[PDB]
Design an enzyme around this catalytic site. Sequence first.
Site, PDB file in Angstrom:
ATOM      1  CG  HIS A  31      -0.432   0.318   2.464  1.00  0.00           C
ATOM      2  ND1 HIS A  31      -1.057   1.187   3.340  1.00  0.00           N
ATOM      3  CD2 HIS A  31       0.739  -0.064   3.064  1.00  0.00           C
ATOM      4  CE1 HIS A  31      -0.287   1.322   4.425  1.00  0.00           C
ATOM      5  NE2 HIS A  31       0.797   0.577   4.286  1.00  0.00           N
ATOM      6  CB  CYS A  68       2.901   3.452   6.257  1.00  0.00           C
ATOM      7  SG  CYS A  68       2.485   2.216   7.307  1.00  0.00           S
ATOM      8  CD  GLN A 106      -6.796   1.479  10.152  1.00  0.00           C
ATOM      9  OE1 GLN A 106      -6.345   1.721   9.022  1.00  0.00           O
ATOM     10  NE2 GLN A 106      -6.744   2.348  11.119  1.00  0.00           N
ATOM     11  CB  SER A 165      -4.143   4.919   9.008  1.00  0.00           C
ATOM     12  OG  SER A 165      -4.461   3.815   9.786  1.00  0.00           O
ATOM     13  CG  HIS A 183      -4.720   2.898   3.067  1.00  0.00           C
ATOM     14  ND1 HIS A 183      -3.648   2.396   3.798  1.00  0.00           N
ATOM     15  CD2 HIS A 183      -5.649   3.324   3.980  1.00  0.00           C
ATOM     16  CE1 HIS A 183      -3.945   2.484   5.110  1.00  0.00           C
ATOM     17  NE2 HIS A 183      -5.130   3.070   5.246  1.00  0.00           N
TER      18      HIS A 183
END
EC number: 5.2.1.8
Length: 145
Positions: free
Chosen positions: A41, A95, A113, A136, A139
């Site tokens: 991702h 990330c 998630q 978060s 993505h």
Amino acid sequence: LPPGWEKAMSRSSGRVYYFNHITNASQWERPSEPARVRCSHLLVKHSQSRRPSSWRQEKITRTKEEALELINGYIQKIKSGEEDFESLASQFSDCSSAKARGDLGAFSRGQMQKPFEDASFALRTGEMSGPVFTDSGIHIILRTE
């Protein structure tokens, strides 16, 4: 059509295309459950991310809208072949998986998630999502296995 896929008409040309309301993928071509999938991702965080910080930037202040513009620019470059997913994830993903070209390794249902999970399992091997929103941030997800 496979899970999550629906038919639409382009606003600018009228031509039929297909979009997936689980992965936010869209494409012209007509499209075509494992215990585990492997994904990479690219995450672009924004000011409402659960943690508004990453290895790129100590304080992330961009808005959700500005995060989504970035994500859409990277999807464009990936689909045009101008840049590879891996190269953009290494440079731009918010990330620590960026250091592995965005690779998360293999995972089953019940670990990530939930919108990320659902998008991951609704991709076929090799397919890429559209913008996928989680706590978060936003993505782009690539299913590699």
